């Protein structure tokens, strides 16, 4: 195997030993990080059929890879905390015995890397200068993995050198369960029918079994970075949130940093990419997935801890998102399950242009008003470093984080939800996240619903008792905003997207106290004289429409929430209840 491995680190090398053992590799390699690495590990893949390595004209370094139809997304059926006790992992977890779980990954984990290399990948979650950074080893038996991994995390080198030799590490074990028996030709794509994503939150430790697909095996990008983090939140002080991390600069050359929880297909993506429509106002962006909060010694302080995007390719365009456009141009990127076009290159549904042929993402020959499937495969990914994004904010590397003026919920709602409405105080502004629903309306609390490490009640608890230990005075103001609210006729009220930037701009104004809105019974909801709209070609009419509290719309928003609410169950805080019936008091 490997005891010329860089790092003396006993407690690392008792547990790769002890997997080996368990799962029986040809041999083990400790990755570096280094460009060599990655490129030999692409030629690998390569020449296994994994990758196929697009045209070095078009893009530098940049390679597409087809997945087998059976492991195409994360699949939140077989996603487990498997906690000591049923009730911290909650109603909205799957949850199984620790014992009983480990008897069952055990035994699919013996034997199943027979015939690969398994790969231990060291990597730093947050930048490199932290206090206390938070580490991880993440052993597979895929390429794909450790050449993915390189770009989502600071992997390797430096991150084992930041470990010492004893200093706690999260312990992350994956395998795509296809095992090789001697002679057998491998797939292109190795993976199961049989998959298990697992969590134990005491532990620190994630068990990924039967996937080689995304957040299912990049170890990293959810499994870690919510589902662990949320947990260590929990115990430490400090939030782990799916939120993207805005800074929006004003025309006087002020700063303003927002965190905003989204579920997908709810537009993070778009708003951490905004291009602002008023004139002096200028954005960049320091993520669209992930933050890591905490108090410094005032206010409260947001990082990335990803290293890349791991972003949806369908959709993407010059229009649409050409900031994406322009990180992935520079290259050094993995997309997958997109389509190949005839001069070797990427396309997808959405981008530009009409190719009258393309290879789909199964391989097969795909033809213009005619194949009656997706070229690209709609959930399909691009993989690519967050450095080359040409709008990343200088401050993203800071592990200082940045001070968050604004925290904003929202999801896809064609009723009831105003534009834009601030919470009353931080309570409330918990209750409006715990409270969050999206397109019948499903709630999706802070947009974490598939992500929490522990019990949801709990994690509410959690949220009050930050803002109660707190120099009110400095955090964040909370916001509810809805994009997606819809006239009698079914078209948007407000035409969005580039135009948030009005909805930011009262937001930074309210922060100014140089704004105003009505009191409300869910919260302050601004007039359409308060908002920004000069430039903008819609009728104010449509405006005041998407600004509106109807009492009797909330009224029947009621019973949903309170079955939410009997759904949290036991652990629902008082907290949230008091701002229940605080609601109720106020609609009548
Ligand atoms: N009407 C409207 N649609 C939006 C807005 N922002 C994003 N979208 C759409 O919502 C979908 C999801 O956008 P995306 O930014 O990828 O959401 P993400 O999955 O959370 O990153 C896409 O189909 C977008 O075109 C908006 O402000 N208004
Ligand atoms: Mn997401
Ligand atoms: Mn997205």
New binding site residues.
């Given amino acids: 195997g490997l005891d010329t491995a860089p790092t003396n680190h006993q407690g690392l090398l008792s547990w790769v030993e002890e997997v080996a053992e368990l799962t029986q590799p040809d041999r083990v390699v400790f990755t570096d990080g280094s460009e060599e690495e990655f490129q030999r590990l692409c030629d690998q893949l390569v020449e296994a059929g994994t990758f196929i390595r697009l045209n070095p004209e078009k893009h530098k370094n940049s390679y597409l890879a087809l997945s087998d139809p059976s492991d195409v997304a994360r699949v939140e059926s077989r996603t487990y905390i498997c906690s000591a006790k049923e009730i911290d992992a909650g109603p909205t977890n799957n949850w199984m015995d620790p014992g009983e779980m480990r008897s069952i990954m055990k035994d699919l984990y013996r034997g199943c890397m027979r015939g690969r290399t398994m790969y231990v990948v060291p990597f730093c979650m947050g930048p490199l200068g932290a206090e206390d950074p938070k580490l991880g080893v993440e052993i597979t038996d895929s390429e794909y993995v450790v050449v993915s991994m390189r770009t989502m995390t600071r992997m390797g080198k430096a991150a084992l050198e930041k470990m010492g030799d004893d200093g706690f590490f999260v312990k992350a074990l994956h395998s795509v369960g296809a095992p090789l028996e001697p002679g057998q030709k491998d797939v292109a794509w190795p993976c199961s029918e049989t998959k298990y994503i697992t969590h134990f939150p005491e532990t620190r430790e994630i068990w990924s079994y039967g996937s080689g697909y995304g957040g299912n095996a990049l170890l990293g990008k959810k499994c870690y970075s919510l589902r662990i983090a949320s947990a260590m939140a929990h115990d430490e002080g400090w939030l782990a949130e799916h939120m993207?991390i805005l800074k929006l600069i004003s025309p006087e050359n002020k700063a303003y940093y927002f965190a905003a929880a989204?579920?997908?297909?709810?537009?993070?993506?778009?708003?951490?990419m905004l291009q602002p429509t008023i004139p002096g106002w200028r954005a960049e962006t320091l993520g669209?997935?992930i933050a890591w909060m905490r108090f410094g010694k005032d206010g409260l302080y947001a990082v990335n801890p990803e290293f890349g995007f791991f972003?949806?390719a369908p959709?993407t365009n010059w229009k649409?998102?050409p900031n994406a456009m322009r990180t992935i141009a520079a290259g050094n990127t993995v997309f997958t399950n997109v389509a190949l076009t005839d001069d070797g290159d990427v396309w997808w549904e959405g981008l530009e242009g009409d190719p009258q042929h393309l290879i789909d993402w199964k391989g097969n020959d795909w033809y213009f008003r005619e194949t009656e499937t997706n070229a690209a495969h709609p959930n399909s990914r691009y993989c690519t470093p967050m450095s080359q994004c040409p709008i990343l904010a200088p401050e993203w590397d800071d592990p200082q984080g940045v001070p968050i003026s604004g925290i904003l919920f929202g999801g896809?709602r064609k009723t009831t939800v105003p534009l834009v409405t601030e919470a009353r105080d931080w309570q409330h502004g918990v209750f409006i996240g715990a409270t969050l629903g999206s397109e019948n309306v499903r709630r999706d609390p802070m947009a974490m619903l598939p992500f929490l490490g522990y019990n949801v009640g709990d994690y509410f608890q959690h949220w009050i008792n930050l803002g109660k230990h707190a120099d009110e005075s400095k955090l964040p103001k909370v916001f509810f905003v809805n994009?997606?609210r819809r006239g009698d006729d079914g078209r948007?009220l407000?035409?969005?997207?580039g135009?948030?930037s009005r909805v930011l701009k009262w937001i930074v104004d309210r922060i100014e106290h140089k704004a105003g809105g009505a009191t409300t019974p869910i919260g302050t909801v601004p007039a359409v004289e308060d908002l920004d709209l000069d430039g903008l070609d819609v009728d104010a009419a449509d405006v005041a429409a998407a600004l509106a509290v109807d009492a009797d719309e909330w009224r029947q928003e009621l019973p949903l929430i309170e079955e939410w609410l009997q759904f949290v169950g036991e652990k629902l805080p008082t907290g949230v209840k008091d701002e229940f019936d605080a609601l109720k008091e106020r609609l009548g």
Avoid at 494 to 497: A, K, L, R, S, T
């Fill in positions: 993207l989204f579920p997908s297909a709810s537009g993070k993506t778009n708003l951490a669209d997935d972003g949806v959709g649409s998102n896809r994009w997606f948007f407000w035409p969005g997207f135009e948030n």
